Structure formats: structure tokens, C-alpha cells
């Protein structure tokens, strides 16, 4: 029994990982119709930031050699025309590098042995020209997607293992995986947006959480645990810079457990050492990126290290509130002083977009950039419909019941006011997971799209219902406990099958015929080195296909993109036309591409259209003729005499418009 249980746990974890992989693949094939799409049409299916990421993978796989492809992407001069940038550490393009490094030898070795990894067939679309659709592992798109989905499949396994760890039973893991599967749409979006950074990084973040829970539960230590924690932290840090903030919320969780005498000294040392080593390795592998410093993650590392290493000097303290308050003050003071003392003190860059978005929601801070962020609904408050969906499947009620039970047991089992510095109070992993859930819930409620973190932790905390100690021990017998636990599963199936049925009976649309004509015209009527400017979603696809150099791009986290974007988007302002022409000449752009729906009044949500956004950023030019009116008039009357410096070179069916800067 002691060995049959563990083998069964591991096998079920692998099985649920495979099932999740198959499910996400089916959803992706239903949504995007890649089975009957040409290669350039798949690039079109990769929209605003997905296209910018995939273009570097395509660049490396088409380079004469892997090293020259890396040298070309680390000395890039076509993403931001005017200077040279290193996109490998700026955009976190390590997954692309790894996938290309694996793809090139694979096709090279398959070709030598004549293995037919790719099969191509003609697809007749209709009035448009027929194209060729190639399906197989040899196709670069399918190789990339298979890598993404193989990585993303392990999230179900990690959730199963976390459910087993916090409940000591397979029933907890089953509850966690069932809650994850019935709320799959509200938990992840990798099926609809593969090339996003979170698709690569979140599995490693949740794996790191699982390993940390295992280490805390069994009080492990040594170099092996450090290696295990680092092998998850480093890949998660090299991908998705936002990972840093996530690892901040983990640290704040660990501290709150450690201050309650639930984490021994040696394992705390092991955890903090693993974090230090992982941060150093990531900082060195990201070419000394200053924005990694002066984040919230490094000062937190230093603060928690100092808190841990001064813990034995305070072992004589008996009043628990004083101990906890003193530790919290030291932690907060160190992290705040180090963050302020390096960003404002020395000007070591920093990415304060999170703080600015949060300031605009509570205060009256408006800004142009925060207005771009908070009018898209994936950076606004969470919607009530999502809460209704989560309560309908009985995920939130289960989590609330489990949290109440844990709080009651913790209160009844722990001496609140007096501490003994030599006794470990047990159940530290559960408290760490509960505090992490609270942090993730606050994050997701403030900014929607941070649900990626909240929903799996709700599934994990729901598994506390299967913990025997929390819910009566031997007072609820064993036959009753199993009887009630299968009842919960039966009720969950009754309210989860409709959700998965709905999620499987949704078929997407894949026409987008206008952008294909626009890109065809770009490829035929413009030269290879023509510089293009416009809205960022259009620019990322203009770079991905037609390979033309661009000025601005949708990657907005770093610095020196906001000024370029603010200068490019002046074509929608009320500035004099000569001034915007001079601005375009100074940036060196040749063509400007936009849509006629970008210059449309809304009157339902003003000041989320560019017409109303520019009045706050440029009050003095209010009362002038808006540039959008001139663009619409020129596109309609077909004679571009009033816009003398500019000239409309592309105008088809009044959707996409391309102006030439003379």
C-alpha cells in the first residue's frame, strides 16, 4: 500500500497532463482552423503581440546558421528603426531560441533519412487564389505549437500534485483537477493565444509552487532541493518578465508563514538560497538587464534573507504580536527603501506600468498610456459574469468552505498571543497556499487577466475538503468520509459537464480577407527597406509578414517605446498637419497604415477613443479641426488635395488606409 499509492499518484498525474494536452489541442484546432490554412494565413492568425514573438522564431529558423540567427536577433535594427536593440532580453525571446535550436537539426536529420514529417495538399478557398496547406510535425508552425502545448499540458499535473499534497489523499487531487477542467476557460487562454509569454512561463511558476509546497511539507533541505527549486525558477524568470512580480507575491507568502513559526530554519535557508541563485543566474543570462533590478523581487529577496538570518537572535521573544509586527516592519522597510533607493535614487530604469495602472483606478490620474491600458478590458476590473461563472460550477463556495474550515482549525490549534521559538506549528504548506491564494485573488480582482493565477489556486484550496484532519479526523468515520467525497464529485460533474460541452461546441471565424489584400499590395508596391508606421497591432503583422522594417510595435513594457508610440499616434490628434508631417519626417517613416474604424466617434465610452484621449494629453489644440476628419474626407472624396503634404496610396473598401509621407 505504501508503494502502490505513490505509483498510482504519479501515473494519474501523467494521465491528466496528457488529457489536458489533448484538450487544449482540440480547442486550438476548433478555434483557429489551422488544418486548412496556408502558412502566411497562420501568420495572420497570430495577431498583435503573438506575431511579434513568432517573427523572431521564423527569423532564426530561416537564417543560414543558428549562431547567425542569434546574432541577427541580438543586433536587431528593423524592429525599432533608428537604432539597434537587443530583442533577446528585451522581449524575453528564449523560448523562440530554444525551439529554433531544436527545430533546425530535426528537419536536417529527417531530410537525410527521407522521413516524411510534412505533407502538403492544395486547398481551394473560393474567389481568392487557391493556396497550399501543409500539415505535419515538419511544418514550423506545428512544431512551435506542439512545443507550447506540451509545456502547457503539465499545468494539470501540477494542480493534481498540489491537490494531493495539501490533502494527503488522491481525492484532493481529483477535486483539484475536476475544478480545473470544469473552469478551464476562466483559468487559461493558451488554447486561443499560444505564442504569448505566459503560455511558456506559467507552467514553470506552478511547478515551482508545487516543489516549494513539497519542500515545506516535509521540511527538506540540502543542495538537491536548491537545484530542484532553481530548475523551475530560472526557466520561469527567463520567460515573461512579469514572473518577477509573481515571485514577489510568493516571497510575501513565505515570510508570513515563517513569521508564524511554521517553517524551520534550515529549509528557510534553502529556499532563500535557491531564490538568490536563481535570480543571479537569470540576471546573468538576461545580459545584465537593469529592469530586473529595482523590481519588487530582488529587494524582497534581500529583505527575506535578512529576516531569516536574524531570526535566532530573536528566539527569546514570547509575545507573538510583537514578533510578527517587528518582522513585518523590517521586511517592508527594507523592500521599500531598496526599491525607492535604486529607482528614484539612482535612476536605474524600471517598469512602473503596474503601479501606474493601479493609480489610475483609485485616483484621478489619467495619462495617455494608462488610458491605452485601461480601456481594453483585459486590464480593467474583473467582470461580474466571471464571478457568476465561477460560482455556478460551485468552485468559489467550495474554496470558501475550505478556507473557513482551515481558519477555524488554525485558530483552535495555535496559541495566538504566545510563541515558543523551538516548536514548528505544522500545516505551513496549507497556510502558504492560502496566503498565495489571497494575493492572487486581490491581483485578479484589481486587474482582470491576472485570473491566470487566481483560478488554479482556487482549485488547489478546494482540495482542502478532502483533508481528514481539517474536517473531523476520525469523528466522521471512514465510510461516511468516502461517501460524502464521492457526492461532492457527483455534484461537480452535474454542473461541470455543460461547461465543457459549451467550450467544445464553439467554432471560431477565420476570414480576415482585407488584411491579406493589404499585405499583398505592400509586398508588390513597396520596396524591401520601406519604413512603416501605424497602430501597433497592424505593425506587428506588417513585420511578421512582408518583412518590412517598422518604427513602433505592441511590446509596451520596456522604455523608449512610449515616446515613439506617442509621436506616431499624433496622426489621430488635433495638431497642425505640417507639424505631424515634420514629426514623421524626423522619425524617417515612409508609409502610415491605419483603419477607418480608428477614427470613429463612440459617445458610449468617450476618452477611450483617440479623439478623446488626445484632448487630455494636448488641451491647447482643442477647438481645431481633428486630423481624423481630414483622413475620412480624403478617403471618401478620393482626391487628396486638402492634405497636401500627405497622399493616400492605398484605399480599398474603406477599411484599411495607407498614406505616403512625401
Amino acid at each position: 500500500y505504501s508503494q502502490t499509492w505513490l505509483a498510482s499518484v504519479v501515473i494519474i498525474g501523467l494521465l491528466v497532463g496528457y488529457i489536458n494536452y489533448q484538450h487544449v489541442y482540440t480547442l486550438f484546432e476548433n478555434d483557429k482552423h489551422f488544418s486548412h490554412l496556408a502558412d502566411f494565413e497562420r501568420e495572420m492568425a497570430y495577431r498583435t503581440e503573438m506575431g511579434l514573438y513568432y517573427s523572431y522564431y521564423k527569423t532564426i529558423i530561416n537564417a543560414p546558421s543558428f549562431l547567425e540567427g542569434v546574432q541577427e536577433i541580438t543586433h536587431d535594427t528593423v524592429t525599432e528603426h533608428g537604432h539597434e536593440i537587443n530583442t533577446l532580453n528585451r522581449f524575453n525571446l528564449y523560448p523562440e531560441v530554444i525551439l529554433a535550436f531544436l527545430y533546425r537539426p530535426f528537419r536536417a536529420f529527417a531530410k537525410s533519412a527521407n522521413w516524411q514529417i510534412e505533407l502538403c495538399w492544395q486547398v481551394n478557398r473560393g474567389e481568392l487564389r487557391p493556396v497550399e496547406s501543409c500539415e505535419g510535425i515538419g511544418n514550423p508552425h506545428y512544431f512551435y505549437i506542439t512545443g507550447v502545448f506540451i509545456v502547457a499540458g503539465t499545468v494539470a499535473s501540477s494542480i493534481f500534485y498540489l491537490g494531493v499534497l495539501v490533502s494527503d489523499s488522491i481525492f484532493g487531487g481529483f477535486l483539484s483537477v475536476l475544478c480545473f477542467a470544469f473552469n478551464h476557460g476562466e483559468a487559461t487562454r493558451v488554447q486561443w493565444t499560444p505564442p504569448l509569454r505566459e503560455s511558456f512561463a506559467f507552467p514553470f511558476i506552478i511547478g515551482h509552487i508545487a516543489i516549494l509546497t513539497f519542500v515545506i511539507k516535509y521540511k527538506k533541505s540540502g543542495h538537491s532541493m536548491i537545484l530542484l527549486l532553481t530548475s523551475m525558477a530560472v526557466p520561469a524568470l527567463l520567460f515573461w518578465q512579469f514572473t518577477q512580480f509573481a515571485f514577489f507575491t510568493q516571497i510575501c507568502s513565505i515570510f508570513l508563514a515563517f513569521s508564524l513559526d511554521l517553517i524551520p530554519f534550515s529549509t528557510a535557508k534553502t529556499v532563500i538560497h535557491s531564490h538568490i541563485i536563481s535570480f543571479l543566474i537569470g540576471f546573468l543570462l538576461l545580459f545584465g538587464n537593469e529592469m530586473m533590478i529595482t523590481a519588487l523581487y530582488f529587494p524582497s529577496i534581500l529583505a527575506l534573507g535578512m529576516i531569516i538570518y536574524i531570526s535566532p537572535l530573536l528566539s527569546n521573544l514570547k509575545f507573538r504580536p510583537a514578533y510578527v509586527l517587528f518582522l513585518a516592519i523590517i521586511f517592508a522597510s527594507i523592500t521599500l527603501g531598496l526599491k525607492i533607493g535604486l529607482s528614484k535614487g539612482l535612476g536605474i530604469e524600471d517598469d512602473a506600468h503596474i503601479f501606474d495602472i493601479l493609480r489610475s483606478k483609485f485616483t484621478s490620474f489619467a495619462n495617455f498610456h494608462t488610458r491605452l491600458y485601461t480601456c481594453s478590458a483585459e486590464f480593467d476590473f474583473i467582470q461580474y459574469s466571471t464571478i457568476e461563472k465561477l460560482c455556478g460550477t460551485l468552485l468559489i463556495p467550495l474554496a470558501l468552505i475550505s478556507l473557513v474550515t482551515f481558519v477555524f482549525n488554525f485558530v483552535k490549534n495555535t496559541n495566538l498571543l504566545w510563541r515558543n521559538s523551538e516548536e514548528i506549528g505544522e500545516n505551513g504548506e496549507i497556510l502558504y497556499n492560502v496566503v498565495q491564494l489571497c494575493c492572487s485573488t486581490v491581483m485578479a480582482f484589481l486587474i482582470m487577466r491576472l485570473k491566470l493565477f487566481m483560478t488554479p489556486h482556487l482549485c488547489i484550496v478546494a482540495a482542502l475538503f478532502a483533508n481528514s484532519k481539517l474536517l473531523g479526523g476520525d469523528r466522521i468515520s471512514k465510510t461516511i468520509r468516502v461517501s460524502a467525497l464521492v457526492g461532492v464529485i457527483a455534484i461537480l460533474f452535474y454542473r461541470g459537464i455543460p461547461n465543457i460541452r459549451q467550450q467544445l461546441n464553439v467554432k471560431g471565424e477565420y476570414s480576415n480577407p482585407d488584411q491579406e489584400m493589404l499585405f499583398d499590395w505592400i509586398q508588390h508596391n513597396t520596396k524591401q527597406d520601406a519604413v512603416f508606421a501605424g497602430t501597433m497591432p497592424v505593425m506587428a503583422n506588417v513585420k511578421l509578414t512582408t518583412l518590412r522594417p517598422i518604427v513602433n510595435h505592441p511590446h509596451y513594457e520596456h522604455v523608449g517605446i512610449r515616446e515613439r508610440t506617442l509621436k506616431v499616434y499624433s496622426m489621430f490628434s488635433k495638431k497642425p498637419i505640417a507639424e505631424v508631417h515634420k514629426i514623421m519626417k524626423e522619425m524617417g517613416v515612409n508609409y502610415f497604415v491605419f483603419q477607418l474604424m480608428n477614427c470613429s466617434n463612440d459617445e458610449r465610452r468617450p476618452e477611450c477613443v483617440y479623439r478623446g484621449m488626445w484632448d487630455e494629453e494636448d488641451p491647447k489644440n482643442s477647438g481645431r479641426t481633428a486630423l481624423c476628419d481630414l483622413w475620412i474626407l480624403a478617403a471618401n472624396s478620393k482626391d487628396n488635395s486638402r492634405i497636401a503634404p500627405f497622399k493616400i496610396v492605398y484605399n480599398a473598401n474603406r477599411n484599411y488606409i495607407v498614406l505616403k509621407i512625401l
Binding site: 478555434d31 495577431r47 498583435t48 503581440e49 503573438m50 487562454r189 486561443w192 493565444t193 504569448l196 491605452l372 481594453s376 478590458a377 483585459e378 482582470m448 487577466r449 497602430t535 501597433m536 497591432p537 505592441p554 509596451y556
Partner: peptide, 7 residues
């Protein structure tokens, strides 16, 4: 939409 949406 400036950036990708949850779909």
C-alpha cells in the same frame, strides 16, 4: 485592440 484578448 492594442493587445491580445482572453477570447
Amino acid at each position: 485592440g492594442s493587445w491580445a484578448k482572453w477570447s
